[PDB]
Write a protein that binds this ligand. Sequence first.
Ligand code: CA
Ligand code: CA
Lengths: 209, 207, 135, 133
Amino acid sequence: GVSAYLSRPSPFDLFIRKSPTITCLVVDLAPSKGTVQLTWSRASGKPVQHSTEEKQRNGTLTVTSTLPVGTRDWIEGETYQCRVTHPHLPRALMRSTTKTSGPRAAPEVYAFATPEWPGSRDKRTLACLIQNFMPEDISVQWLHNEVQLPDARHSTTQPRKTKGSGFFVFSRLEVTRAEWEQKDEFICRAVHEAASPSQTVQRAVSVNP
Amino acid sequence: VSAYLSRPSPFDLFIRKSPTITCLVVPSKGTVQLTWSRASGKPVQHSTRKEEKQRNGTLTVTSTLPVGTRDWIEGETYQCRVTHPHLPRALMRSTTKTSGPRAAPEVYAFATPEWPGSRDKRTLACLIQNFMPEDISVQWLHNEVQLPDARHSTTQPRKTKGSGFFVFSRLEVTRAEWEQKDEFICRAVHEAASPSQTVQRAVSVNP
Amino acid sequence: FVCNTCPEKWINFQRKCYYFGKGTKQWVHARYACDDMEGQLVSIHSPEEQDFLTKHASHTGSWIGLRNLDLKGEFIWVDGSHVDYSNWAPGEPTSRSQGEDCVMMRGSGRWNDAFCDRKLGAWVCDRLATCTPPA
Amino acid sequence: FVCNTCPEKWINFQRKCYYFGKGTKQWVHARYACDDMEGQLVSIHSPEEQDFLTKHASHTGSWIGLRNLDLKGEFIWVDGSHVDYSNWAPGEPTSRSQGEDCVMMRGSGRWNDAFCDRKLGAWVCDRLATCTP
Ligand SMILES: [Ca+2]
Ligand SMILES: [Ca+2]
């Protein structure tokens, strides 16, 4: 038994950084003493750019190829394919990816902060709820001192469907007293296709203002 | 063919005092056989089978076994065995109480600001965090009555920066609910929550 | 100095050359085709330009060089130029989404927004025609 | 009356019989064992009762009939009685979690809370001694 994955670029990389990449991730549920051959191909037959393996903490090999794509190329509807030459499945793997074509909706941003819990005076947890957007592709970021907090620092759920047509995520961010006793304002950013202008919706959030 | 086995809901266990576990297996000649057995070798109660066809030509069949309250808490290991014509070597799933450190959940509950073009509806949010183990039951309340499970949606427990876990729950609400009685309770049943295995936060739409 | 020289298989009109390609192509695949033919998808700017194309336009429908950077919400020709001339069919653009960040031309010469992954049997390229020194 | 009669392989003390089982078992598997033997996990109530047991306790350690309903936080003997006599080893119960909702007895006769999924090599059962008329 064995699966593989191919992930669209990050709204951030695409719309803002303007250098989107897709990644083909293959999870091997038991690695054999051979190589894996991740091959890239465009549905047009145009040349793919040059693309960019790890032992997991349970003896499973996880190898990921990061192919950088064209900004315009992607947005216009180019289909990208991942062909993985595996030594254990009778034939190959054909994972394929393209721009999700249908309705738009701009995301709703909400940022809160947790009330004080006794014995944790030095830290608080800020929540952000980003909802009613579509398609599911969205990038979520936290800001301070008008520089962006690194990715590890917070944790954002996989987009789930809402009761209606939208999608929603929550982002959770623990902050030290040092941080909010410098500038007591933290911005929750969401880069989404439908968000205008400049593909951005953001809320600002204060620990007891 | 994968196979799965889920612990009871802390609500069934701690409050309802009638916990159930479920063996979920995600298809041809359906001679499927879900077998139940205790690690002690003691007799298991009678379980509830139901098979269902999914909206992609996959069969999803689940067996729900009811367990002893005390027996579960005290550490009994329950097992699920499956034998089948389209299966090579029988799948054997086991479940037991997660034996580890405990931490009671921190509950916080919000109602979302008014959105332009959406007057008669709001969205309530509930963050339950820093608890362990991950097993946790989330519920929403209104006028003595517990809101139906479909009404809200709660995340799979993710690890926190520290040692605990966190879940979020999301709840869309009508004007007639809150104008009637503008109080909505977010309730957590968790193992470590004292007293009587409950933590809850009340939240109002513009209090 | 007069401009009407076209390379073979290109039909001229005023100071541009026009190629009317055929084959099931998506919009972006329609885009590629014209680059490889050293032109670009068509950019319609004059009602006269539209008249000329309407008479050569496939009745199945054609792909034209109109879409948006998304980071816009506004349509723009593949040459970079904005929309001065428009030939919108009734009800169209249904855009704001929908969808349909790509503009297609019906048999009637009328424009309508259809999805980009949608496949059409024809597309129209253009390029600048080349000219001839005076004597 | 006089009560000191025990069914075979059971050791007597005061008005009760005690079985010192041996075998790798979890706490609840150790509880089962005692049921099958028509007794229950041991419930210690007097310093003399503990002193008796200390002499027969395996070095490896032993399972005793003390735990909680969780819907407590407070330990209770499998016979239903609360804790009147206690023989906690120092810094124990480490409970309040941790976890360790089950109590074991050391070689020393001292008690310590250990996790219930842990497997120990001995357990002690008890039952009421029978009497000679
Ligand atoms: Ca349309
Ligand atoms: Ca201890």
